[PDB]
Amino acid sequence: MNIITVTLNMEKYNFLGISIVGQSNERGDGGIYIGSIMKGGAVAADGRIEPGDMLLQVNDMNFENMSNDDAVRVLRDIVHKPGPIVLTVAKSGGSGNEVWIDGP
């Protein structure tokens, strides 16, 4: 799987706008994944993250060793702190990278 790190524009978009599923803290767990992406949020507007992508890190925090409950708490704690939000994901879900339509 391709691994990508994306910097979200929280200042502009105001909310992250993702759900998560899964867990990663027990041996044998499959990981934490993006469930759905809400229109208008920072993740949606970036365009590269998709449902089914595997969530690996938020900032410096490792989401390959977290329960679902812990993941939700960490994410909610981070989204209300000033400072960057940067997500690292594995592309198990598909990226809609920026493509120019045309030009002069």
* Interacting residues of 1 by C-beta distance below 8 A, sequence separation 6+: 54, 90, 91, 92
What residue segments make up the domains of the chain, in order of their start? 1-104
For residue 69 the two structure tokens come to: 């409950």
- Single out the residue of 58, 54, 60, 66 nearest to residue 23, CA to CA: 66
CATH 2.30.42.10 assigned to domain 1-104? The reply is: yes
| β-pair partners for 5 | 88
DSSP H helices in 1-104: 10-13, 42-46, 68-79
Contact 8, 86 (CB under 8 A): yes
Q: How many whole angstroms separate alpha carbon 85 and alpha carbon 93?
A: 20
Ranges of beta strands (E only) in the chain are: 3-8, 18-23, 31-37, 54-58, 61-62, 85-90
Q: How many CB atoms lie within 10 A of CB 49?
A: 24
- Single out the residue of 57, 102, 63 nearest to residue 84, CA to CA: 57
Q: Which residue has the tokens 């490792």?
A: 62
